[PDB]
Design a binder for this molecule. Structure first.
Ligand SMILES: NC1CCN(Cc2ccc(CNC(=O)c3csc4nc[nH]c(=O)c34)cc2)CC1
Ligand SMILES: NC1CCN(Cc2ccc(CNC(=O)c3csc4nc[nH]c(=O)c34)cc2)CC1
Lengths: 206, 206
């Protein structure tokens, strides 16, 4: 797989060079590229942002600088991923289907976001997905991109109940006797019950 | 605020030293500490994991090594955050209330997770929260911790419709005329409509 990440903060994607994402690149399975958006600016200040039309707080990421960036990087086979709090939610279903792609481009937005037309224009030649990682507000799209990339890369290099290891008794807390029984069907029966219960208390919607 | 992050991958928390999270530490508003869990191991191999009781795939993070780590770092006033796919969902409501804390500890889990007793024992002296960032599977809790910390740190240093900046016309795509009208009540009326519509198409549950 080929992954290109476009951002004003390349260093924010350095965890992708560590642990399993790093093992995926070193195995030669994934080719990761992280680009500074400012490499496509031609002004003396390397401005990527500007004042929003219709006013409002914050700044808006310039469409022509992004347009130039994505014009060189993308092709008609590219899946352009635009992380945004306005997108559809990222799930494991999304991670699983992204493993069937040869080229993923992550257009990481800063300030108030990216000029909407970048997405409309890109959709003329390639598929585009606007995706949120959850119901919370982040200052940028780089942390979201790390999350999405390691979840895809986890499958590439191929509610949960509680886990216990040695010792059997620790600080007055004993490992449930059932996990020391040797009855594999009984162990499975318990794990289902505890998971089902944990699911009702924390995520009844699931 | 004081933030301590315990992990087997300290480098995975380096984006917190960049952008706004970095501005929060440099402003002296937040004191960030990232610890290697292996600094609390006494064996020759610095083993943090071991085989699970009742069997099953993968390894389980040892409770005594974590117990020793959290014993030194935490106090009775500490809010211990255990990122896990078994936790309650992280939202903006959670980020907003975490801004009222003086000490947050992030116990980042690897392998199949942390021995459940670490959480049960810690809950004897301090408050504990098991939290998931979404309906997807990650190889570790460090990316989740970056997400949660920048969302809290964003508020500390204090669906959305589309955004547009200069030029008015780009690649045959014009900025909606309404944003060039000068009628602030009309601009607000439109922004509500487009957001409400985007919300119905992507997040009707919201
Ligand atoms: N007081 C208001 C709060 C919301 N602001 C909008 C806004 C704009 C840009 C962002 C940046 N978001 C991301 O890059 C992002 C990218 S993926 C993602 N998933 C969940 N939440 C997220 O914030 C993100 C967040 C919020 C406007 C001012
Ligand atoms: N084939 C099975 C797939 C699930 N595995 C369980 C498992 C254990 C540990 C993790 C690690 N998760 C996190 O550290 C985590 C921490 S916060 C979070 N939020 C959403 N999703 C997440 O995975 C996380 C993920 C899945 C068992 C094998």
């Amino acid at each position: 797989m080929r992954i290109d990440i476009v951002t004003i903060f390349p260093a924010c994607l350095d965890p992708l060079r560590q642990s399993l994402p790093g093992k995926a690149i070193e195995s030669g399975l994934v080719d990761l590229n992280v680009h500074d958006l400012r490499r496509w600016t031609h002004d003396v200040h390397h401005s990527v942002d500007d004042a929003p039309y219709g006013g409002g707080p914050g700044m808006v990421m310039k469409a022509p600088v992004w347009g130039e960036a994505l014009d060189e990087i993308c092709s008609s086979e590219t899946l352009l991923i635009v992380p945004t709090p306005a997108g559809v939610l990222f799930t494991q279903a999304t991670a699983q289907r992204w493993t069937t792609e040869s080229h993923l481009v992550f257009a990481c937005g800063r300030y108030e976001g990216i000029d909407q037309r970048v997405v409309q224009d890109a959709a003329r030649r390639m598929r585009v997905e606007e995706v949120s990682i959850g119901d919370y507000v982040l200052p940028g799209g780089e942390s979201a991109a790390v999350v999405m990339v390691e979840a895809v890369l986890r499958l590439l290099a191929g509610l949960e109940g509680p886990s216990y290891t040695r010792p059997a008794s620790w600080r007055g807390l004993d490992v449930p006797e059932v996990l020391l029984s040797g009855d594999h069907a009984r162990i499975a029966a318990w794990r289902r019950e505890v998971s089902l219960q944990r699911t009702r208390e924390r995520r009844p919607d699931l």
